[PDB]
Symmetry: C3
Subunit: 259 residues, 3 copies
Amino acid sequence: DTRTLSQQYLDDVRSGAIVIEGDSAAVSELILKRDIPIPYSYIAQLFATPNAFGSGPACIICHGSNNPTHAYRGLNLSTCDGLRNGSTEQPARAIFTPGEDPKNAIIGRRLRANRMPLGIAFNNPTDSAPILAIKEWILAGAPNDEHFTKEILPLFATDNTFGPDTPHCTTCHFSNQEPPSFHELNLTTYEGIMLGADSVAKGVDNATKVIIPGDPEASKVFQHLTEDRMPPGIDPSEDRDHPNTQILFAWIKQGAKCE
Amino acid sequence: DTRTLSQQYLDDVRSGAIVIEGDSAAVSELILKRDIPIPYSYIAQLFATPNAFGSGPACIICHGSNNPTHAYRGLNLSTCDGLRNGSTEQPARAIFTPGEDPKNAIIGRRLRANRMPLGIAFNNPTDSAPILAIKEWILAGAPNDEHFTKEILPLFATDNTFGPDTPHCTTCHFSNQEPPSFHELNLTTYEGIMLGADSVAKGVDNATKVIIPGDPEASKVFQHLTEDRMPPGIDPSEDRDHPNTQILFAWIKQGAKCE
Amino acid sequence: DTRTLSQQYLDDVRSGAIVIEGDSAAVSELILKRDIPIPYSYIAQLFATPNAFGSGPACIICHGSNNPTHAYRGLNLSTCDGLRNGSTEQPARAIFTPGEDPKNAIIGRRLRANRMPLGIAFNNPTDSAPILAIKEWILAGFTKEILPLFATDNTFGPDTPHCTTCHFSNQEPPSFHELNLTTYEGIMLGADSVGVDNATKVIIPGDPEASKVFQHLTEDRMPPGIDPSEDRDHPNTQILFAWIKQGAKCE
Ligand code: HEC
Ligand code: HEC
Ligand code: HEC
Ligand code: HEC
Ligand code: HEC
Ligand code: HEC
Ligand SMILES: [Cu+2]
Ligand SMILES: [Cu+2]
């Protein structure tokens, strides 16, 4: 106990414990690192203010109610209870779990995860023929059979597969070396797809699995194929590590408290 | 219909009914088109936040009371009731009518209509001699008589008429061909003035009469001469179709409900 | 005199009393000039909103409480009484005085005074060897121990220009705010000597805290890491000062 915020700051400026890289810095090093408590009052404002996590209309316009005709998915982001409840319209689901890191919970993917193939517009269907094919393949336990090789593998290497005028996934995900291949993810072979991302620069048994056999809902490929970044139409190049995103995550790790 | 937002959406991307042009898109096709209900809470934030409709101070600073010594025109934009009442200081007048399209109501012109001649500074009087002349000419039924040709017609073709270092209207409004004449409006002759704008590339059925004989208050000419765009000093080139404006308009058409 | 806001305006467009220079103008000529009353409701929104005075996180995040372990300096900017009270943590002190101009008060300096040397990062210490050397000299009311620090590169932190880089002459361009930091007299005369006997005094002997030099050396502009070139006369700053001068009223 006992040592003040001011006291640690004076000590950390002294030790060089504060590192400054593309500030931002004020937030990572003085707010998150020292685990300062975030009031719901600030979070409420975030969901209610246009451009709060990146370019686009305020979240509560489209998600301002638990009535599915007044709000998409009957998701009410405008109150603390509404946030904690998540989507109401069938199929109902929480968009995060209080006290747990939401980085990969639904609210996190919707704020940070660009839909794939990178740049594809939201008015392309998320239940098209190929997506549904990939879905069934994952359900099937993600087999390396004849069917996969002829009917599934080329989806990652063929132009205009998931919408008009879009590049094959293989354009950007084709090796295990970062530069030039993003997240060290290789989608050219079965072996590469099941291996997943970040397999070199951070373990190989600690790879970020991108297909989870039997569970399409949790498979990062399927998610990126079917989930549009919010607010709809946001440009993929907008900061995925926006301070407001981070502060929101912090408030959730702290218990998503209502005061 | 009794169909939910989500359902309308999954149906609209499939059919291709969603058109994307320079977002904007999220707002026009998902918010306005689907007739989503706008809460007063958001509107309040619009009038209380600086730069909400384009660059400048928050509206409620200058319009925060029905007491004419605390607020210009005794106009209170800070409460729902204040909005509905409008300007209180004599001459008292509503600034919109609940349930009616406000695009050309007082609130609409003050957000979207740049004062003419374009760019003229707001510290130029709005009751100068030329304006009053034009006012009276419209009161008289806008005759094409001897008087008009001599005393009124040149007011649109003479530099520095409505203020210092301002170009003649005739600089930008001189034919019915857009490029080069703005809004296809011609102020060089009586015939052109009564004809009005937008009569050509979209026909005589999208014509916009710009002088309404017997009513200066309703004549778009008189309006542009006397009404400074808000907040004062806002650059003419600021988006005249700001999303928050479009949302403000929507809330008014829905009835300006206070919850 | 008993004319409404609207009436004063019409008289002022007519009189030419309204002057427009790089707007900005609406707030200086219509809000501040006519002393429109500023509501606390707006002021609260200012401390609660990110980027309200320039780039950076909202003030009430780091200063949201009178508990020095939940808010820096035990300063609560999130309530009206919190504001008036100021810093709770020792040394406890108010950050402004209601009814008095706050421009060079603590809240004003933190909004408007870029830390020196210009551009210096906030993770550089403010009780380092050179600065502490200087603190005692002002307390004392020389040439070898104090003076050279203003013409020396990398004095107060790594990769920083010597103060003399920007303050080396008598008039404005190329010397900012007409201040010359190379000699004893230029330092005691102060800035804006072109002045010359009402020049903005920059050192107050016996009082480090009111000496503008000590202030700029030890006080980081808020929010921390804000780029020095961000408008130092932000309209929201000006409105806040207006609210303080009006009595810092809570209703
Ligand atoms: C309309 C203009 C929207 C705005 C503004 C925001 N979102 Fe949204 N959201 C919108 C649609 C059409 C959908 C898909 C609906 C469907 O039935 O498929 C979504 C989806 C979400 C979700 C996921 C819902 C779920 O998994 O059950 C989330 C978590 C979400 N949106 C959040 C969100 C946030 C945080 C926003 C502001 C930054 C935001 N949305 C804006 C439409 C619109
Ligand atoms: C470049 C033009 C790309 C194409 C084509 C595809 N993706 Fe992509 N991917 C790209 C980037 C820049 C990123 C990083 C995140 C960001 O939005 O900037 C990603 C990431 C993924 C991931 C997540 C990886 C993780 O470690 O969590 C997945 C699962 C993914 N990409 C899959 C994927 C698929 C299936 C694609 C084709 C349909 C595809 N990507 C195309 C860039 C590009
Ligand atoms: C002062 C700094 C102002 C700010 C900020 C805004 N407005 Fe304003 N407004 C101001 C003046 C000096 C005037 C004209 C006064 C006169 O006596 O003629 C106006 C006028 C309006 C009106 C017209 C109402 C009428 O009855 O004629 C409207 C509807 C209006 N202003 C709205 C408005 C909005 C929406 C603002 C924010 C975007 C806004 N004003 C800012 C002074 C100031
Ligand atoms: C160019 C430098 C212009 C001068 C000089 C004047 N106006 Fe104009 N006007 C201009 C533009 C670009 C527009 C479109 C709206 C915008 O703000 O960008 C207009 C519009 C009008 C209108 C309304 C037209 C409509 O379709 O409703 C009117 C009635 C009008 N302008 C009249 C007008 C008068 C009387 C002028 C001289 C005092 C004048 N304009 C100058 C560009 C320019
Ligand atoms: C953390 C991320 C902060 C944000 C956001 C803001 N400020 Fe701050 N402030 C912060 C620190 C680390 C310090 C120094 C602490 C120390 O012990 O020296 C300060 C200091 C101030 C002060 C001075 C208080 C005093 O007693 O002298 C003031 C008046 C101040 N800060 C105000 C302020 C404002 C107005 C902010 C938003 C615009 C703001 N701070 C943001 C940390 C952080
Ligand atoms: C530029 C490269 C600078 C260096 C190096 C130093 N200062 Fe400076 N100073 C600079 C500017 C552009 C300004 C104007 C205000 C602003 O923040 O932009 C200032 C201001 C001061 C003042 C106050 C002047 C006044 O009229 O009140 C002081 C007292 C001051 N600066 C002192 C100072 C010291 C002690 C420096 C080195 C240790 C120093 N300055 C370096 C630009 C630059
Ligand atoms: Cu302890
Ligand atoms: Cu029906």
